[PDB]
Design a protein around this ligand. Sequence first.
Ligand SMILES: O=c1ccn([C@@H]2O[C@H](COP(=O)(O)OP(=O)(O)O)[C@@H](O)[C@H]2O)c(=O)[nH]1
Ligand SMILES: O=c1ccn([C@@H]2O[C@H](COP(=O)(O)OP(=O)(O)O)[C@@H](O)[C@H]2O)c(=O)[nH]1
Ligand SMILES: [Mn+2]
Ligand SMILES: [Mn+2]
Lengths: 284, 284
Amino acid sequence: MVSLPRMVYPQPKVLTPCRKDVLVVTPWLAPIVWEGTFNIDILNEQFRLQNTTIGLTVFAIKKYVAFLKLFLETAEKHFMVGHRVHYYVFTDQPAAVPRVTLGTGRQLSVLEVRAYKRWQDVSMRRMEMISDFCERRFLSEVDYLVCVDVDMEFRDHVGVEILTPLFGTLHPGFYGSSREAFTYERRPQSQAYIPKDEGDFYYGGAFFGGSVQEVQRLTRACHQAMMVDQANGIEAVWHDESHLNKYLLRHKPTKVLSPEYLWDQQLLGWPAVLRKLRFTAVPK
Amino acid sequence: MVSLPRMVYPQPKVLTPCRKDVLVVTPWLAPIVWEGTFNIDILNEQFRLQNTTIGLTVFAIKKYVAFLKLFLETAEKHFMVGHRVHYYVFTDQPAAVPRVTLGTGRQLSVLEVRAYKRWQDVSMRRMEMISDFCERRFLSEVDYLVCVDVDMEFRDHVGVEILTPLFGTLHPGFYGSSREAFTYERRPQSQAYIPKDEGDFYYGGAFFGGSVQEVQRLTRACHQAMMVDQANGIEAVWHDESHLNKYLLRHKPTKVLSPEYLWDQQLLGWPAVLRKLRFTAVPK
Ligand SMILES: O=c1ccn([C@@H]2O[C@H](COP(=O)(O)OP(=O)(O)O)[C@@H](O)[C@H]2O)c(=O)[nH]1
Ligand SMILES: O=c1ccn([C@@H]2O[C@H](COP(=O)(O)OP(=O)(O)O)[C@@H](O)[C@H]2O)c(=O)[nH]1
Ligand SMILES: [Mn+2]
Ligand SMILES: [Mn+2]
């Protein structure tokens, strides 16, 4: 990496934590990203100097096309502003994608794919489709991939602080829960099985990412695991999210995002521990 | 990575920090390594699965050969035990290197180099010498390089928790100090110059490291800066440490080690904030 320029900002204080109310590093030394833990000016410098391109995948199959306008418009206000962004919209209805005005250095591609009848299958098949397009396109077109649900909107900054070889996001329903309470797949017959004495966190299927290489590996593995389960007459309790959790248990993420990055205010309010609500559920 | 095996350990608690008394992550999201922040079993698994080899460089020029016996014997007890280790002892007196019994998977190489007259030159020229041998040997022989002073002994675990592309260590004299008090080079004529309003930390010249590529970059850059200074007729106030600090200001380390890793118990005692004293000064 090339040198940063002179910058003036508050000195970090070794004997003064940024946050004392939350865990800010995992036991494998991956940062857990909360507001107050990062200086976004330093991080922007680091990633801009490397001319980073970020891909964002989103699936808008069947009626879910209705979520695209707000998803994309709010993404324009909050997601990686100042950096190169390439949106990839996976849909069975190219003509139904709204014409959203994009900022400079940002582009959008529509990837036409099949629709599945069951929402579970639409959700699950994202793994296969992302993996497939890593090979077809993403490896050549972007440096990182961020893979999210479409039934969401950005309300605050989501930026290069999340970028790392592999990240998961704390599910907003479980961040304060004991591992026994996590809704991992519990049947040993399933490839997603995690027993009650294992597990670090419950990650949300709605927001993960990393380098293209790591996301390719993750999505390929989750898809293969789902195909094995299918052959064994089993479907994991929480579908792709169950498999995501099994993957990230055994392949530790190099950053973990706090629930600021995946929230539902209707269901969970605005707890003191959340200084910002960045990416939130839209009522559906 | 390849998958980790099933492991049983206590669950990380999102709403319960491991350490509330110290900063455990930098504003650029690099872990600051303190006892309690890492699970060494997880980390050992990760690095052993990668067949990691760690190089350790140490200079024992002139009278400093006296320190080698204790340095090496204690390294055998505490440094990277269980992993492949390659010691590189730089000396003007190959015959004076004590014969120290090494554990399996550990090797020692004696590198014969010139002895400079001025201690300042001895200390400063380590940068050139490390950089030269990165090309000569380290690139093909080790994955990471750890570069330390010889007038030291290991007293507790120093392991794979430190490994990362680039690391510096908090100097024990300044970890609680404001940047204005840091003994950076303050003369603008010097390549190591840092203004009073810049600076994250004061890093110790006695303990830094990283991937071979990053250590080659750092040591080459510091040597070049020193040569420019020499041509301009100036020598930085704290020699190689001043240049190391300039380098790490502009090239942020991906981990920072706490003063557990670089201490002087005679001068500073054993404060409560240090749960372990791992690598400590030998009186001289
Ligand atoms: O008919 C569907 C069902 C699902 N999805 C995609 O699959 C994601 C996950 O589904 P959903 O959001 O309904 O799951 P939930 O958040 O309720 O767990 C959605 O965001 C969409 O991106 C879709 O496009 N069309
Ligand atoms: O005559 C010398 C002077 C320096 N050194 C090496 O340079 C390092 C830095 O010097 P020193 O330890 O004296 O610096 P200090 O810790 O006192 O700042 C030493 O640990 C030795 O490894 C050496 O080998 N011989
Ligand atoms: Mn959703
Ligand atoms: Mn020393």
